């Protein structure tokens, strides 16, 4: 089994202060709702990706499914800000989070899993139909469902997701229904 | 064992549905409630059911009967809980000084 | 009135040691008790605190005396906040 990435959240400093009204009026697919939130929400189409551009020149880029695709979408957002007229430098690009999900191909019985690992797992069925297991060494949060689908979140690199899944796989096989 | 693991599964996974208690409370208030009210009110009523069944199985163990719960152990459960003030009735103006 | 808690309450009685197959009359008594408890709590909550509004704060003051129920409300609220933070 391999976990495929579903969501990459990155951040990039453009270095130049922006007034948001000209970007909202000139650029396409740009949504600005200040009485609601203080950023410009611009979406692109080729890589299905969304950017929140802030007035201090920092940009949050969400939605891509690899590191190179997130970097390429961030470059596209920087050049569409640039060609409007602002002098925009690609100062620092950092990926805040990487999210992956996988299916372990059998039903899982969660009551023994909270019974034997109650130090790291918080499970409340009514609030959410999933078990939050916190791995202490990778620093990942895993939502483990009864149907067999596991969602790994809270990672910076890919190898952390891979090592967390290889860590939590023998426990899940030990607790098969 | 193999029944204790099934019983512990039903002790945790069972809940009253939030789509009906939000319909039930709003028929008493008149206008609207919030999600953090319905989350708490669905949780207290599970403790209150667990206050009765854990005490109605004390009535059945006191008398000479088995685990199936007849209503005799359930009217006696509300009687013993009310004498310890656990069951609140806001229609009986009580008076302690006589 | 119909029974809005017929199948849900049978899982809960099994959760506290009754049987896998309880009696319909016992399930009916439990359902009536739950509806009465919810109604009483809602009236007292409307009286206490903001008149005509039932809030979490009012519900918490009402359940303060009973230890088992107060602990459950606090745990559920804290866990809800934690799950929202994780999301």
């Amino acid at each position: 089994i391999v976990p495929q990435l579903q969501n990459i959240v990155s951040t990039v400093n453009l270095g130049c202060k922006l007034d948001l009204k000209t970007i909202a009026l000139r650029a396409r697919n740009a949504e600005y709702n200040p009485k609601r939130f203080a950023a410009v929400i611009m979406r692109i189409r080729e890589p299905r990706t969304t950017a929140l551009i802030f007035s201090s020149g920092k940009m949050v880029c969400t939605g891509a499914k690899s590191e190179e695709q997130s970097r390429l979408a961030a470059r596209k957002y920087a050049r569409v800000v640039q060609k409007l007229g602002f002098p925009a430098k690609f100062l620092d690009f950092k990926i805040q989070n990487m999210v992956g999900s996988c299916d372990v191909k059998f039903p899982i019985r969660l009551e023994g899993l909270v019974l034997t690992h109650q130090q790291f797992s918080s499970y409340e069925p009514e609030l959410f139909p999933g078990l939050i297991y916190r791995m202490i060494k990778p620093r990942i949060v895993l939502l483990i469902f009864v149907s067999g689908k596991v969602v790994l979140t809270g990672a910076k690199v890919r190898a952390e997701i891979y090592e967390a899944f290889e860590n939590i796989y023998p426990i899940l096989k030990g607790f098969r229904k | 064992s193999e029944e204790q693991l099934n019983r512990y599964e039903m002790y945790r996974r069972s809940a009253f549905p939030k789509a009906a208690i939000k319909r039930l409370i709003q028929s008493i208030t008149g206008t609207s409630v919030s999600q953090n009210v319905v989350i708490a009110m669905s949780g207290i009523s599970k403790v209150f059911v667990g206050e009765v069944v854990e005490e109605a199985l004390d009535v059945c163990e006191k008398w000479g009967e088995m685990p199936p719960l007849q209503p005799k152990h359930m009217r006696e459960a509300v009687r013993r809980l009310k004498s310890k003030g656990q069951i609140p009735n806001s229609k009986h103006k009580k008076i302690i000084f006589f | 009135r119909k029974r809005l808690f017929s199948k849900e309450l049978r899982c809960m009685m099994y959760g506290f040691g009754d049987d896998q197959n309880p009696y319909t009359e016992s399930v009916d008594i439990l359902e009536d008790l739950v509806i009465e408890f919810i109604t009483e709590m809602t009236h007292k909550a409307m009286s206490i605190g903001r008149q005509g509004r039932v809030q979490v704060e009012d519900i918490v003051f009402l359940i303060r005396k009973d230890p088992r129920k107060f602990a459950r409300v606090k745990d559920l609220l804290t866990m809800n906040e934690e799950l929202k933070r994780a999301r």
């Binding site: 999900s101 069925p125 959410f128 139909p129 999933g130 939502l143 469902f145 009864v146 149907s147 689908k149 969602v151 | 099934n6 039903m10 996974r13 069972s14 199936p68 007849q70 209503p71 | 199948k7 849900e8 049978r10 899982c11 099994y14 896998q20 197959n21 309880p22 009696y23 319909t24 009359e25 016992s26």
Partner: peptide
Amino acid sequence: VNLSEESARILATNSELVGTLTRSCK
């Protein structure tokens, strides 16, 4: 989408195991 379909699977097994036959009492 994962939260929407998995919520009803905690309750679907709560109608297959418990309460198979319906009883009554005098």
